[PDB]
Structure formats: structure tokens, C-alpha cells
Write a protein that binds this DNA or RNA. Structure first.
Ligand SMILES: [Mg+2]
Ligand SMILES: [Mg+2]
Ligand SMILES: [Mg+2]
Ligand SMILES: [Mg+2]
Ligand SMILES: [Mg+2]
Ligand SMILES: [Mg+2]
Ligand SMILES: [Mg+2]
Ligand SMILES: [Mg+2]
Ligand SMILES: [Mg+2]
Ligand SMILES: [Mg+2]
Ligand SMILES: [Mg+2]
Ligand SMILES: [Mg+2]
Ligand SMILES: [Mg+2]
Ligand SMILES: [Mg+2]
Ligand SMILES: [Mg+2]
Lengths: 121, 56, 230, 247, 68
RNA sequence: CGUGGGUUAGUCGAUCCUAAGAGAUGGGGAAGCUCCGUUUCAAAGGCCUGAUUUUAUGCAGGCCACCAUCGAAAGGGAAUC
RNA sequence: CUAAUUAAAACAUAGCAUUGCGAUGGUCAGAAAGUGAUGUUGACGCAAUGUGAUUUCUGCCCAGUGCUCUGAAUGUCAAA
RNA sequence: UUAUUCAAUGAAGCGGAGCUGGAAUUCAUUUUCCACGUUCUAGCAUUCAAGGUCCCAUUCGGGGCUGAUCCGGGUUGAAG
């Protein structure tokens, strides 16, 4: 009776086949839609005088965004809703528990024109 | 600082010898001498041992 | 070849790191591999009382070859030939109508532990094959005494797996022949002659002889050192 | 009616060993084929100080027999062992100070330390500073050896048990006086919380069996049986004779 | 059937037969877990009279509990 | 008191690391709530193939012996004036 | 050290001394545990106490009670 | 020694049997035993091991065996 040469004293668990799942029914049968689309990210402009001073002077569009939106989902939503390009997004969570985005556009655009194009001032 | 060594190039991190940035050129030279003087001792200790058991 | 040289390494103590030797002797096996080996050890260490290891005297390879050669001729019906023979027995209802006897007497081996014990007790069995490897052995350990008392020849054979092969199970633990075809009567008789020669005629002596007590290799080879030195 | 300080120590809350700064467990090299049939050569690379231990630790570096790597064992340094010294452990080894040999393969009157009580438990006898073990006998059939322990007792250990030649270094340490509670403070800072000690006679009766009364006095005999329990074993436990040794 | 012989022999606990079988089996049960699946009953006859049937749905667990 | 405005970070911290410790798993105890233990007596496993046309890169070699996780806004730590 | 009436001569202290223990152990935990502290330890150690730096001394008592003893083995001796 | 108990390890070399040479004065017999690749020195030791051998279908490379005795799968030592 021959036997396998075992150079290690340690017996490890063998590498059995791990089949993939192939379920007989779907888990939820209708996928959820996009839980954070562009209209969920951007809620409304912030229209304070302080936020209105930043429209002309700084070329920043100040928005109120979802609390679940990061600086990628803000930038992506601002781009395809308002047909702009964003240079930078600075975000703060306000002391009323809402998220405020300072969205600065690139120099090719003008946040004063786009503010009228949205509808505020 | 230990993570700054990934930014600088290889010249700042090694001397052009064997065991460059590891040892200190006197410990290397002593290492070369100590290497050499033992195989010449081992060869001598081999022919001393072989001859003295070849007799009796 | 002047380019190639011979190193030979000094695999002694304290020098020149050891090579990849076989350590199959030294594997820490999984916990089940120890207990399935040390249970077989612990059985043959203790004094096995003769009602066990009246097994492990097994019908040997040449005469168990004859036994399974006969018993394979009388293999039971599969589901393939059963579903066919019910359709011919359907045609018995359709046009045959003997009474319901489109099929002959089937000559099959008799299996199933309750069935065979009842076949021995009515003395209908002509030869019984007993598996040695069944667990719990309590299921079969009374069978040689019963077969000796009713005068049925019995063989302790190797393989409940192999007994299951001829009955189309995976495991059978018993297999009996209660009647053979008339062309195979001498074939059974010369088997019965040697099987009582090995099992039933020794039974009155095997009943006294205990088993086990077999020492392991190191402690056996240290026992004869004490014998030679004293 | 309150649990005493000697009972509270077993819960191990504030009474553990202050073991952050210690260099490891000072054990012998694990008994293998190199140390059972021939020898193996080590090298001291450090004589370091162990926190809470009065004896220096020798870091001795060996080669692993089966894998290409270096294994650093931590020894208790023997007095005379230096850095850069080759150290031999095994059966066929030579008697020098710091070499590790079985007790059977060293002669009568050999002075050993870090001596195994059972073969392969990696050092149990003669480990405090200055102490040693003398081999005083041999019974080569049914291999045993008689020793003298540092208490003065006589022990019979297997001849396959190991030891390191020499005394444990750092001897003469307790011969120096501490002179002040400060030097006691930092000795026990790195060992465990056993210092200071309040006398039980300086207490209230709820705290100790010796406390209370209008004068500090013991009241009952301080010698208590071995057949007593916790809370009564506060004094001299299972004493044979008390007081000075004057016959 | 065979369960009648199983029933009577199981009553002979201090017989030399079962006293060996109890010794070998009590060692094997310690080297397994405290609670572990039995593959099949060690006493099939005792399983019948208590309710077990050999079909898919019936499960045996061997278990040891500390005496005293 | 009423109404509003206000806190913008790749570089500052958290996040990551371990400390004293806490704490699952395997397993044992306990009638049980649960207790012990943190590598144990467990079959506890991911890492690159040199480099691509039979490659969703394996259906292969080859390597590794450790074994959760939590624990610092004063300790360790990539980088802004 | 008595927070919030007692800061002391009380507590601690180094020094001294006694006691137990060589690990299958001493001392102590835990309801138990394949469980813990001392212990990453090993008599120059750990644990239990007493006295309290140095100088100089620690007399007499083993009847009591405790502690201890490879001590006596038909006095007493439970269960089985 | 197999229950049980202690301990150790990445369960790595355990047990038995096999080369020599002798103060085995071989007693034509291992009644018999002994030594198993390493010690001036703070170096190095890793690539299934080079060598040797045989095979491949040879592909510029691949596989065995020996190097590295054989057998028993009892990890090893205690305690019982
Ligand atoms: Mg904010
Ligand atoms: Mg921010
Ligand atoms: Mg066993
Ligand atoms: Mg005091
Ligand atoms: Mg008081
Ligand atoms: Mg206000
Ligand atoms: Mg930073
Ligand atoms: Mg982590
Ligand atoms: Mg963390
Ligand atoms: Mg620090
Ligand atoms: Mg006060
Ligand atoms: Mg601890
Ligand atoms: Mg006096
Ligand atoms: Mg009585
Ligand atoms: Mg091992």
C-alpha cells in the first residue's frame, strides 16, 4: 500500500469546489430605482444674501444637498442638471442638520447668469 | 522620517558597496576577513582530520 | 563537464538546512482521523470476548470468490426489470389471465436483517452470508449462535458494502440463499461443505477463545527485549 | 466580616505582574533532534536587562534546522557569558560556562543553572541571580540524577533534563541595602503590587484576625494549621518551630 | 425479526459481550463533541419503540451531561 | 425675548496602528440568564502566476504555519504655507 | 491618613527576624470549567507575618492553649 | 498499556532492523558492547540540491531514483 508523501506535519482543510448561487427565485423581483439621482442630490438653491454675495463675487453656486450625497454625487448632479462644469465642491452640514454645498464653477461659466437661468435673483 | 525614504531615490539610500545601507564599511571589511579566514581554516581542519584518521 | 560541479550537502546535525523529507508519520491529522484510527487500535488492545472476533475469521479470498460467483446469478430484480415485468403482468390482465401468473418463480437472494433472522428461525435458509464490518455489531452478533442452533450454514464475509452490491443496495449486512435453481444445487453444496468447515464446525471452539490483547509495534518490540534479557 | 488583603490577591485585579517592559519569557531552546543526538551552536548578541528581574538576559541566536531563518531564544545570562560568544546546546556539547547539556552527560559536582524539572519544560531550577545547582549523584540504570537545589533540598530529576553551566549572573544583589522606601518603591514598581505592607495588628477586627483591641496585640496564637482556610491563614502558616534558631 | 434479539441482549449490560462494547463506545464518545450528530442509532430497536423511523426527517444527536 | 444669518479641508483632527485592557469564534462549563478562554486539544488560508490569445487571467504551478475585532480628537502617524 | 470637628506619639518605611513552598507546589481566586492570580515567575523567588534606621542588648519559662512531629498502636473509631 | 492524568511541538526525525574496527584476546555465532558529516574566530548557509544515474519524445526542457538505509504510519516524553 503506497501513500502520499506529506512534507508538512500540518493538515489543512482541502480546497473543495465552492459553487456559485443559482437561485430558484429572485430576492426582491423588482430592483429599486436610483435612490440618489440628480433630483435627490440637489434640493434647492440657498438664497441668503450671504449666499447671494457668492454668486457674483466668487462664482460659487450655493446649493442645499441631500445628507447622503458626497462630493462626487454633488458634482455629477450639478453638471447634468445645470450643464456646467464644477471646479470644486466644498460641503458643510448646517446646524439645522441640512447639507450645504459650495459649488464653484470653472471660469468658462458664470454663476450669475446661471442663477438667473435657474430662477433665483 | 521612515516614510520619506519612499520619495527619495536609490542613491540617497545605499552606498556603492556590498551591504551598502545595511552595514558600516568596517563591519563589512571585518565580515570579508572573517569569511575568508574560516574556509582556509576549514580546508586545513579537513586535511588535518582526514590525515590523522588515515593513520590509525 | 567542467562547468558543472558536485556540491554534496552536509545534512548533519547543526549544519546545512534539512531537506523536504516525508513526515506522513508525523502529520497532525484531523480529529476524526485520530479517532477512527485509535478506535481500531483500542479494539485490538483490549481482550475481545469471543462473541466479538468470532468475526474477523473471514471467508477467505478464494472461497469468497466462489460464494459471490454463485450469489450473483440469483441477483434480485432491479427497478428496470420490475417495471417491465409489471407491463407483461399488465398483459396478463389484458389477455393472459392464467390467474395472475405471467411471471415464474423468482429465485433471488434474501436480504434485510429482520427478514433473514426470520428465515433462519423457520429453517428455510440454505446459506447465510454475514457482514463482519457492521456497526453497531449488536445487530448481527447473535446471528452465528442462531444459525448454529437452527442448523443453517453461515459465513462471516468481508463487506457490508459488497453484500449491498449483490442486492442493489449500498449496504446489506446479511444475504441469504433459501433456494437455488436446480442446475446450481451442486454449486451450493460444495460451498456449504467448506463454509461449515470454516465457521460452524469451529463454532464450539471459537466460542471459548477471546480476542485482542495485540500490543503495538514499539511495546511489542520492547517486550521481547525483556524476554531476551531475563 | 470583610475579605482580607491576602484573599483579595487571588482575584488578580490590581495584584498582577507589571509586565510591559519585560523582554519575554526566559526559557530554554525547545528540545529537538539537534539537542538530543548532537549539538547546535548559538551566538550571544545581547546581554540585556530584564525589568523586575535581578539577573541579565542573554539573547542567543540559533539557526533553524528545517527552515532557512534565524530563531532568537532568550536565555538567562550566566556569569561569564559575554556578547559575541558561541553557545552550544545539545547532548554532545562541551562543558563550558553557558553551554547547555543534559544532566546525565555532565559529571558529578558540575554547577548548572536554568535546570529543567522535567525534560523539555524549558528551564525551572536555578533562575534567580547568583543561584546554581550542584549534581551530587547518578543512577544510570533508570536514568536519574541527584541534585542540590538552591534551598538546600535534594531533588531527583531525569538525566534527559537540561541545564546551563555556570551560575546565574547578577549575584550578590540582595547584599546591598535599599536604605530607603524609595528604592523599595521602584523595585516593586516593575514587579507587582505587594508593597507596602500594613501590619494586621495595626488594623480593625473587621479587616484582620490580628486587629483591634485597646493595645496592638495578636490575641490568639499566630501559628495556624495547614488544615485551616482563607481568612484564618493570617500569621505563621503550618509552622514547625517559631522564633530564633537557638538550641 | 432481529429487534427482539436486540431487545433482550441490550438488557444484559454486565454481560462480557456488552461490557466490552460499552467500553469501546464510551471512549469514542469522549473524543467527539459534547453534542454531536449521530449518523444512525446505536440502538435501532430502542429507537423503534420510542418513535424513530428510518426516513428523511428523523435525526439522532448523541449528548453527554455531567453526572452528580 | 422675537426673527434670521452663520461653521467650506487631499495637507487640521477623526478615520488607520497598537498600549493597559476589552472581546467574538473553536471548545469546555452552567438548569438557565450566560460563564471561561483569545490561541487555545479546530480539517481555522490568501498570495503572487514568469507574464496576456484554448483565459470571465487559471482547469497548474509556485509561495506562505500566522488565526477575529474593539481600544488614544495628548502616544505612533503621507503631505500647506 | 480620618474629603466636611481628631495630622498625631497613629500608618508606612529601610533594617531585622520568623514561617510555608522544588511546581503533581506554597498563598489565594471561581458556581463550574479543556478556568484563573502570583507567573513574560523558580529560593538572591514567591507568599504569610511580626518588629520597625543606627549604638548596645533581647534573661528565665513548653505546665496551659495553639502550631508541629518517618513519632504509641485493641483507648475511642463513622459509612461501606 | 489501551482507560485516565501531566506536558510539549509548525505534532521533524520515535521504535526495531540493517556499514565498519576491537583489550569480540572473533571461539568459524555479534550469548557480547561501543561510537550516527557541525567547537581557535560576532562571516555564510534559502530556489524540489548540485553531482550521478535512467527514462522522455527532447521543447532551448520535463519526469523518476539515488544523493538523504529499510520496515511499522504509535507525534513525543512521562504517569498509570
Ligand atoms: Mg459641516
Ligand atoms: Mg468639512
Ligand atoms: Mg485510543
Ligand atoms: Mg508594616
Ligand atoms: Mg485602628
Ligand atoms: Mg436669538
Ligand atoms: Mg495629518
Ligand atoms: Mg485592526
Ligand atoms: Mg482601532
Ligand atoms: Mg511613545
Ligand atoms: Mg479633617
Ligand atoms: Mg497572567
Ligand atoms: Mg524575649
Ligand atoms: Mg460503620
Ligand atoms: Mg513534534
Amino acid at each position: 500500500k503506497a501513500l502520499k508523501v506529506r512534507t508538512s506535519a500540518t493538515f489543512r482543510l482541502p480546497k473543495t469546489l465552492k459553487l456559485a448561487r443559482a437561485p430558484k427565485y429572485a430576492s426582491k423581483a423588482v430592483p429599486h430605482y436610483n435612490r440618489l439621482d440628480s433630483y435627490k442630490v440637489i434640493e434647492q438653491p440657498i438664497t441668503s444674501e450671504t449666499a447671494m454675495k457668492k454668486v457674483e463675487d466668487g462664482n460659487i453656486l450655493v446649493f442645499q444637498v441631500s445628507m447622503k450625497a458626497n462630493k462626487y454625487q454633488i458634482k455629477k448632479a450639478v453638471k447634468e442638471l445645470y450643464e456646467v462644469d464644477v471646479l470644486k465642491v466644498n460641503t458643510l452640514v448646517r446646524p439645522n442638520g441640512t447639507k450645504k454645498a459650495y459649488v464653484r464653477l470653472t471660469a468658462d461659466y458664470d454663476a450669475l447668469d446661471i442663477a438667473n437661468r435657474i430662477g433665483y435673483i | 522620517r521612515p516614510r520619506q525614504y519612499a520619495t527619495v531615490s536609490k542613491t540617497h539610500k545605499t552606498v556603492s558597496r556590498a551591504y551598502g545601507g545595511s552595514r558600516c564599511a568596517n563591519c563589512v571589511k571585518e565580515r570579508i576577513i572573517r569569511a575568508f579566514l574560516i574556509e582556509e581554516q576549514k580546508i586545513v581542519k579537513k586535511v588535518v582530520k582526514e590525515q590523522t584518521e588515515a593513520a590509525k | 563537464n567542467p562547468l558543472t560541479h558536485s556540491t554534496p550537502k552536509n545534512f548533519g546535525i547543526g549544519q546545512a538546512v534539512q531537506p523536504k523529507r516525508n513526515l506522513s508519520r508525523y502529520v497532525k491529522w484531523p480529529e476524526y482521523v485520530r479517532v477512527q484510527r485509535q478506535k481500531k487500535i483500542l479494539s485490538i488492545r483490549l481482550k475481545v470476548p469471543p462473541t466479538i472476533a468470532q468475526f474477523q475469521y473471514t471467508l477467505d479470498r478464494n472461497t469468497a470468490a466462489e460464494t459471490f460467483k454463485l450469489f450473483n446469478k440469483y441477483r434480485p430484480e432491479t427497478a428496470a426489470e420490475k417495471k417491465e415485468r409489471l407491463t407483461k403482468e399488465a398483459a396478463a390482465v389484458a389477455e393472459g389471465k392464467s390467474k395472475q401468473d405471467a411471471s415464474p418463480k423468482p429465485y433471488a437472494v434474501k436480504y434485510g436483517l429482520n427478514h433473514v433472522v426470520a428465515l433462519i428461525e423457520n429453517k428455510k435458509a440454505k446459506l447465510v452470508l454475514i457482514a463482519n464490518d457492521v456497526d453497531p455489531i449488536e445487530l448481527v452478533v447473535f446471528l452465528p449462535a442462531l444459525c448454529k442452533k437452527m442448523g443453517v450454514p453461515y459465513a462471516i464475509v468481508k463487506g457490508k458494502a459488497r453484500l449491498g452490491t449483490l442486492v442493489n443496495q449500498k449496504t446489506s449486512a446479511v444475504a441469504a440463499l433459501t433456494e437455488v435453481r436446480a442446475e446450481d444445487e451442486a454449486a451450493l453444496a460444495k460451498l456449504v461443505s467448506t463454509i461449515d468447515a470454516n465457521f460452524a464446525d469451529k463454532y464450539d471452539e471459537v466460542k471459548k477463545h477471546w480476542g485482542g490483547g495485540i500490543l503495538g509495534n514499539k511495546a511489542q518490540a520492547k517486550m521481547d527485549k525483556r524476554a531476551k534479557n531475563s | 466580616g470583610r475579605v482580607i488583603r491576602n484573599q483579595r490577591k487571588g482575584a488578580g485585579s490590581i495584584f498582577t505582574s507589571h509586565t510591559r517592559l519585560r523582554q519575554g519569557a526566559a526559557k530554554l531552546r525547545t528540545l529537538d533532534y539537534a539537542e538530543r543526538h548532537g549539538y547546535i551552536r548559538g551566538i550571544v548578541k545581547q546581554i540585556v536587562h530584564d525589568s523586575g528581574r535581578g539577573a541579565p538576559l542573554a539573547k542567543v541566536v540559533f539557526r533553524d534546522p528545517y527552515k532557512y531563518r534565524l530563531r532568537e531564544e532568550i536565555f538567562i545570562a550566566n556569569e561569564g557569558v559575554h556578547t559575541g560568544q558561541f553557545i552550544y546546546a545539545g547532548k554532545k556539547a562541551s562543558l563550558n560556562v553557558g553551554n547547555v547539556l543534559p544532566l546525565g552527560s555532565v559529571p558529578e559536582g558540575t554547577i548548572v543553572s536554568n535546570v529543567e524539572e522535567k525534560p523539555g519544560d524549558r528551564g525551572a531550577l536555578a533562575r534567580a541571580s547568583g543561584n546554581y545547582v550542584i549534581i551530587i549523584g547518578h543512577n544510570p540504570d533508570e536514568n536519574k540524577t541527584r541534585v542540590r537545589l538552591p534551598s538546600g533540598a535534594k531533588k531527583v530529576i531525569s538525566s534527559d533534563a537540561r541545564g546551563v553551566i555556570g551560575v546565574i549572573a547578577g549575584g550578590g544583589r540582595v547584599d546591598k541595602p535599599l536604605l530607603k522606601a524609595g528604592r523599595a518603591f521602584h523595585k516593586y514598581r516593575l514587579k507587582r503590587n505587594s508593597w507596602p505592607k500594613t501590619r494586621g495588628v495595626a488594623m480593625n477586627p473587621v479587616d484582620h484576625p490580628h486587629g483591634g483591641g485597646n493595645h496592638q496585640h495578636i490575641g490568639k496564637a499566630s501559628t495556624i494549621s495547614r488544615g485551616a482556610v482563607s481568612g484564618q491563614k493570617a500569621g505563621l502558616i503550618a509552622a514547625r518551630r517559631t522564633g530564633l534558631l537557638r538550641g | 425479526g432481529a429487534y427482539k434479539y436486540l431487545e433482550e441482549l441490550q438488557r444484559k449490560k454486565q454481560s462480557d459481550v456488552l461490557r466490552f462494547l460499552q467500553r469501546v463506545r464510551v471512549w469514542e464518545y469522549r473524543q467527539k463533541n459534547v453534542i454531536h450528530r449521530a449518523a444512525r442509532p446505536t440502538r435501532p430497536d430502542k429507537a423503534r419503540r420510542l418513535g424513530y423511523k428510518a426516513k428523511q426527517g428523523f435525526v439522532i444527536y448523541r449528548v453527554r451531561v455531567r453526572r452528580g
